[PDB]
Amino acid sequence: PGAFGDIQASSLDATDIVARTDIRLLKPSVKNIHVPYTQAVSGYEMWK
Amino acid sequence: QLHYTVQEEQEHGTFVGNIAEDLGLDITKLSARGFQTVPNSRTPYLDLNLETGVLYVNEKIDREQICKQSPSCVLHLEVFLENPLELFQVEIEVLD
Amino acid sequence: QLHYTVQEEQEHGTFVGNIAEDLGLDITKLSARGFQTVPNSRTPYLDLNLETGVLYVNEKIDREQICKQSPSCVLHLEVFLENPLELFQVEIEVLD
Amino acid sequence: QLHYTVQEEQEHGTFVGNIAEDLGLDITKLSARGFQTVPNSRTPYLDLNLETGVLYVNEKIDREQICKQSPSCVLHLEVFLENPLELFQVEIEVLD
Amino acid sequence: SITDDFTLTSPYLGFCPYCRHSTPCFSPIKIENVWDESDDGSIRIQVSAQFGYNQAGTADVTKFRYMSFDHDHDIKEDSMEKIAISTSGPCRRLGHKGYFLLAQCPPGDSVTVSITSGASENSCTVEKKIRRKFVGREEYLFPPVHGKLVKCHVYDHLKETSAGYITMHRPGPHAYKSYLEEASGEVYIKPPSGKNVTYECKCGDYSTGIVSTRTKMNGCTKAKQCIAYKSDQTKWVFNSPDLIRHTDHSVQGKLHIPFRLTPTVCPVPLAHTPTVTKWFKGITLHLTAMRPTLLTTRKLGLRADATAEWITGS
Amino acid sequence: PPGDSVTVSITSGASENSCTVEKKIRRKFVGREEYLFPPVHGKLVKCHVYDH
Amino acid sequence: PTVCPVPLAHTPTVTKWFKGITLHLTAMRPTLLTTRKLGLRADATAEWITGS
Amino acid sequence: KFHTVIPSPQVKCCGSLECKASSKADYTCRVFGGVYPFMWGGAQCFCDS
Known part of the structure; x- marks a missing residue:
């Protein structure tokens, strides 16, 4: 995660995609309804 | 978050709702948790009752003045407690 | 750059002008140069004819709706070609 | 700073005030100090008289045009002198 | 397949972080995504309403339909003259269809969408970085009049262009507190006039049922022991993180994303x-x-x- | 919002005026992280504000 | 004095x-x-x- | 560049749930305790933990 090639596939319209983006889920604090998360930056943008 | 509706032409303290009852936090204990109104709140028209958690009506409601500034005729209000800290929201709407 | 005038109450494709004829770029060759309308253009009311370079009228013209947003009642449109690249401008006005 | 009032419907130069007399700076000397109007001033309606320090009225006063742009119907004007340098302010108001 | 019959879909309402004042609220114009991959500053916006269609689903280009802050939770409509967009100053509106908008904005740090004067005024703001971009090896404020011609990619202004699709599902349950009642140690159920409502309670064993008139739930004593909701909801919604799902969360249709990205030509300056x-x-x-x-x-x-x-x- | 001056004016009507005064006004935050808006998922700390 | 919410990092x-x-x-x-x-x-x- | 899709959560009033496993890209799942959640109409379950 965080570098070039964090998501990969053999073609743009394929069905088998692998990735590793370091996603973790947290516990809700305010009680309305939602799901919070945090994630790393995309390596594509960092390479550009 | 919370939603209650008030009728036109009230007479200084009929009834609105029961906050502590709907939120489950129980009576006889909130007198020490620090039950309070937030200073960034508190429309002039309503009043709290820190003991039995009910909502008053302070002065007679006037639709003309109340939503001449916020066209969707609504009213905002918040409360908070301590040990540990919380923050809740309530909205009231004026009918016709 | 270019200037044509359309009358009120048209009936889906009478006539407006002849772009390729006035611009001198000849027929029978523009079918391969890449004759196209620009995506940042194309009012809903008019349509192109990539073969003989004439201007349609798509749906009936309505002065009330058309220049309720641009008081000077006008309409904008562009075209471009390739090998080598060009860029032209056309304006249409609604009369009464 | 200074305050004079002008009546409606004046006829090209009746009278307004006496600036040098009220400010104490004396006659017979200001002709050399450099008595002047400031370029960032000078409404079209009034005129100065560099010799005897009195205020004219140039063209007939029109309340409709004059305070269609500054609702509080007032008029601004400044003067300055040299050796040593000074800067004074005057305001005029249109009555009814 | 991909469809275009909007008489089978409905709008919804979500949870905006920064409502009018500062507080979080429930809003009819929640902002889901923003996209700015173009080469002249344009951006694409997805919201929770449906622009360009009338109160029943048929199409006309002067109206939009939304969900209601009131009593009886139906769909309502109003004219498009009341929609505005801003980041630091006002922006220009370029196209609209479905859940989607297109606009052109100056630099800034936020994006806003508001319903101006009228009943149901609101807004919603979302954090986003928007700066100025140029094509080539020289900087400019405006595209000049004497230069060269190169290749660029921009957003199409037409609305029949396509770039993908989104999925639609069946709507879940939504419980209203107004349908409950309480009178001297007995609990009752109060439907709106002449419609079917479903109840569900536990004061002992489990219990369900559909009713049509005031009914007494025997065994329960408090109000916070049952819930109730109405039971004819054949209208599809979007897979949004602010809703509760049905027991059958399978896909029932697909819808278009307009405003494609195409290639064109652009002019650029020449140095000294x-x-x-x-x-x-x-x-x-x-x-x-x-x-x-x-x-x-x-x-x-x-x-x-x-x-x-x-x-x-x- | 941020800026460098403060103004008070009586809008249309008889006796229109204003008055401006120099003053520095910037953005401030509480804690050990920067933000534009107060977010929706977080912690709760102590602060001091002006009563309405 | 009152209470205020603040963000949490990664x-x-x-x-x-x-x-x-x-x-x-x-x-x-x-x-x-x-x-x-x-x-x-x-x-x-x-x-x-x-x-x- | 990637696009993070987050579906609509499911809740079970006073029973219990556990997670399956799927083939999608970077799948992640978690379960949480007693919550009592709220929407515009009010409270949404009938067992309060």
Whole structure:
């Protein structure tokens, strides 16, 4: 995660995609309804 | 978050709702948790009752003045407690 | 750059002008140069004819709706070609 | 700073005030100090008289045009002198 | 398949972080995504309402439909003259269809969508970075009038273009507190006039049922022991993280994303020709540039020795 | 919002005026992280504000 | 006095070697980092961090 | 560049749930305790933990 090639596939319209983006889920604090998360930056943008 | 509706032409303290009852936090204990109104709140028209958690009506409601500034005729209000800290929201709407 | 005038109450494709004829770029060759309308253009009311370079009228013209947003009642449109690249401008006005 | 009032419907130069007399700076000397109007001033309606320090009225006063742009119907004007340098302010108001 | 019959879909309402004042609220114009991959500043916006269609689903280009802050939770409509967009100042509206909008905005740090005067006024703001971009090797504020022509990619203004699809599902349950009642240690159920409502309670064993008139739930004593909701909801919604799902969460249709990305041509400026001075094995370039510009050199032998520099001034 | 001056004016009507005064006004935050808006998932700390 | 909500950052990952650690950090706005040693000497640090 | 898709959560009033496994890209799942959640109409379950 965080570098070039964090998501990969053999073609743009394929069905088998692998990735590793370091996603973790947290516990809700305010009680309305939602799901919070945090994630790393995309390596594509960092390479550009 | 919370939603209650008030009728036109009230007479200084009929009834609105029961906050502590709907939120489950129980009576006889909130007198020490620090039950309070937030200073960034508190429309002039309503009043709290820190003991039995009910909502008053302070002065007679006037639709003309109340939503001449916020066209969707609504009213905002918040409360908070301590040990540990919380923050809740309530909205009231004026009918016709 | 270019200037044509359309009358009120048209009936889906009478006539407006002849772009390729006035611009001198000849027929029978523009079918391969890449004759196209620009995506940042194309009012809903008019349509192109990539073969003989004439201007349609798509749906009936309505002065009330058309220049309720641009008081000077006008309409904008562009075209471009390739090998080598060009860029032209056309304006249409609604009369009464 | 200074305050004079002008009546409606004046006829090209009746009278307004006496600036040098009220400010104490004396006659017979200001002709050399450099008595002047400031370029960032000078409404079209009034005129100065560099010799005897009195205020004219140039063209007939029109309340409709004059305070269609500054609702509080007032008029601004400044003067300055040299050796040593000074800067004074005057305001005029249109009555009814 | 991909469909276009909007008589089978409905709008919803979500949870906005920054409502009018500061507080979080429930809003009818929640902002889901923003996209700015174009080359002249345009952006695409997805919201929770449906623009360009009338109260029943048929199409006309002067109206929109939304969900209601009141009593009886139906769909309502109003005219498009009341929609505005802003980041630091007002923006221009370029197209609209379905859940989607297109606009052109100055630089800033936020994006806003608001319903101006009228019943049900609101807004919603979302954090987003928006700056200025240019194409080529020279900077400019405007595209000039004398220059060259290169290739660029922009957003199409038509609405029949496509770039993908989104999925639609069946709507879950939504419980209203108003349908419950309490009278001297007994609990009752109060439907709106002449519609079927479903109840569900536990004060002992489990219990369900559908009713149509005031009914007494025997065994329970408090109000916070049952719930109730109405039971004919054949209208599809979007897979949004602010809703509760049905027991059957399978896909029932697909819908288009308009405003495709196409290639076109763009004009760019040309700099000021430099003067050269010659000495023994070298040169000297006298340059002029009133905005940043680029310079690159390389050697034609076995070694390259590349350079690169952005230059300002003389 | 941020800026460098403060103004008070009587809008249309008889006796229109204003008055401006120099003053520095910037953005401030509480804690050990920067933000534009107060977010929706977080912690709760102590602060001091002006009563309405 | 009142209460205010504040954000929480992204948990870091650690790598271990002989007498040391390495922290891989992520921050899209400025954030703070502080360390000290538990012995007779403190050796305090402090830094505002941006990026990864 | 990637696009993070987050579906609509499911709740079970006073029973219990556990997670399956799927093939999608970077799948992640978690379960949480007693919550009592709220929407515009009010409270949404009938067992309060």
